[PDB]
Design a protein around this ligand. Structure first.
Ligand code: TPP
Ligand code: TPP
Ligand code: MG
Ligand code: MG
Lengths: 182, 165, 182, 165
């Protein structure tokens, strides 16, 4: 699987959820595939996707929320998982696009991410499913927190287009849709 | 006393959400935070945090939920979450009131606080983080000025605490 | 069991070992129990005892060294357990004295440490044991890396004297012993 | 070729242990580090790290084992490990050579590098951390100046890399 198909899969499974994407090529690819007001692109501050997501799911617990992490972003601030397992937000979804490298940087090898599903289940995640290349779909429980491990092959497509939204515009649209939904 | 007045003035002005990593000088604040009495009485949403950066990220996320949050921390932890402030809060204009424990402010503290103690204000000024020194005679007015500044700038402001509360 | 018993017990098991204690009450208790030249007290940089221990094991794989961590210090930079299980140091010993609170600052509630032994075994630790507060015995495989989870009761005694060695004196007392050792 | 000369000079001066996280501007240096034959020809051990703080920690540990280490990182990553410089390295006098990628030094980069790009030198000087801009015409001389300062002060010094290597 490539990142394009994985992002399209995640967007198809939850087309009515708010997403927080980590910095680098993941946010760029998400913005290029589908630009949504419910998408919060973190242009910088790597490793903060999951903390911001936990705060959002703390204030708005009923809303479904997806964190779009990579293997490098997940690993950099791994300890946050404990807090998530401690908070156990029922509608928190943790996606990890694992390509085994810092791709948005040049393809440098990351620390190998092993048995992510099991340790996710240990810290307090209600379910942690793994995805091999070619899985059409899967039915997931409506009660989280959840962890989705999608091992994606290195990209062959073009880098895409950088997100043109000013960070202030990103927070404006995100907050406005959050207020309009409830 | 001082911690009670600070927390009361913050709660009256709709600052109810808290993340932090403890320090010796901020013990009374964490007492009032972890008190089951104050959580139900003052409507206090406190989230334990493993690291200052995760605390700041969760605080920013809670701000994105339409709530006003402050963050407690030892000044040493500023060297752990600084990137966040320089790559998220001041870039996205996400304000979080910072209650920093100024360890080593007088140079007689433990050896681990020597550098940060004499260079805290210089660090904040070089990196353009605005701060206010806690006036222990009128702490409510100091945090009032801090809240005024963050509402004027939509960016975080720190309150520096060098004596025990 | 209190921290005194845990420290004395691990000292009895590994008398010729090198120690890297974390900042706070742990380093001071270790110093007051037994001031060893082979002890490296970290006065600051909370969550940085496991990194320096991993580096020491990297340069000196055959020498045995342990890391005295608390619940707070372990949770702060837990993310290093991945680097530990990736580098797989054979003589690395990981001690986590879980008192469930931030004792060195007033006993603040820490995020609950949950299923640490299983997570260690998943991230690449060769073994991981959990210790009951009643008995006194150490049984582990010779080859590591290994984690030792010890739940400790809140200290009944006073904190006692602080480390009098200056950081430079600690550095020299430790590095002289290491250089002569290997 | 410039990163090649830097790495070769470091290894000739017995700097053989490397940690850190990648940056786009340090692409060639990480390619040289993760090369198995460059590992064999120069006796290099590269410890890939999850974050800047753990990288600097394992580098300090490897220094304590009689080795001489350097740590590469993006300038943003400074905000994640500055504490361990002010609470450990500059306290215990444990010197690590720092290759910091000065992102946003020209003001026309991505928004995430704006603050650090403007204030990297101000932040480094605010906590008495010596830096040195890379001389792309004589990159070996910059490494030599850094190593001379490291020897003289037994404290970590940094070099600032603003162009691609
Ligand atoms: C502390 C810090 N160091 C470095 C960077 C630069 N950086 C951006 S993305 C990235 C790699 C991200 O890896 P990953 O999460 O796996 O994204 P992907 O490989 O899928 O593109 C790095 C090193 C940063 N933003 N913050
Ligand atoms: C980044 C950072 N935040 C806060 C502190 C202050 N601090 C020192 S020790 C400590 C708690 C240590 O907890 P633990 O490792 O469990 O030691 P124990 O509670 O068992 O005594 C804190 C919060 C610090 N030194 N560095
Ligand atoms: Mg990736
Ligand atoms: Mg503790």
């Amino acid at each position: 699987m490539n990142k394009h198909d994985a992002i399209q899969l995640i967007l198809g499974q939850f087309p009515s959820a708010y997403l927080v994407s980590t910095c680098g090529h993941i946010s760029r690819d998400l913005y290029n595939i589908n630009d949504r007001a419910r998408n919060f692109y973190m242009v910088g501050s790597m490793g903060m996707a999951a903390p911001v997501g936990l705060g959002l799911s703390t204030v708005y617990p009923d809303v479904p929320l997806v964190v779009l992490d990579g293997d490098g972003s997940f690993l950099m601030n791994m300890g946050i998982i404990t807090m998530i397992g401690h908070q156990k937000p029922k509608n928190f979804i943790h996606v990890v696009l694992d390509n085994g490298m810092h791709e948005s940087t040049g393809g440098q090898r990351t620390v190998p991410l092993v048995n992510v599903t099991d340790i996710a289940l240990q810290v307090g995640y209600e379910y942690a499913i793994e995805i091999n290349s070619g899985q059409k779909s899967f039915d997931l429980p409506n009660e989280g927190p959840g962890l989705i491990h999608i091992k994606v092959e290195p990209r062959s497509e073009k880098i895409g287009k950088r997100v043109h939204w000013t960070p202030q515009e990103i927070v404006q649209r995100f907050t406005n849709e959050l207020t309009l939904e409830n | 006393s001082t911690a009670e007045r600070m927390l009361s003035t913050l709660t009256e002005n709709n600052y109810t959400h808290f993340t932090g990593v403890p320090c010796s000088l901020l013990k009374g604040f964490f007492r009032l935070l972890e008190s089951k009495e104050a959580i139900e009485k003052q409507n206090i949403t406190f989230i334990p945090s493993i690291r200052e950066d995760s605390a700041l990220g969760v605080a920013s996320g809670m701000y994105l939920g339409g709530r006003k949050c402050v963050m407690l921390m030892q000044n040493s932890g500023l060297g752990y979450c600084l990137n966040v402030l320089t790559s998220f809060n001041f870039i996205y204009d996400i304000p979080i009131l910072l209650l920093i424990s100024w360890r080593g402010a007088y140079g007689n503290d433990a050896v681990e606080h020597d550098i940060i103690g004499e260079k805290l204000t210089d660090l904040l000024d070089s990196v353009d983080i605005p701060y206010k020194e806690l006036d222990y005679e009128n702490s409510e007015g100091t945090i009032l000025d801090a809240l005024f500044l963050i509402e004027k700038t939509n960016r975080p402001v720190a309150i520096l605490i060098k004596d025990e509360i």
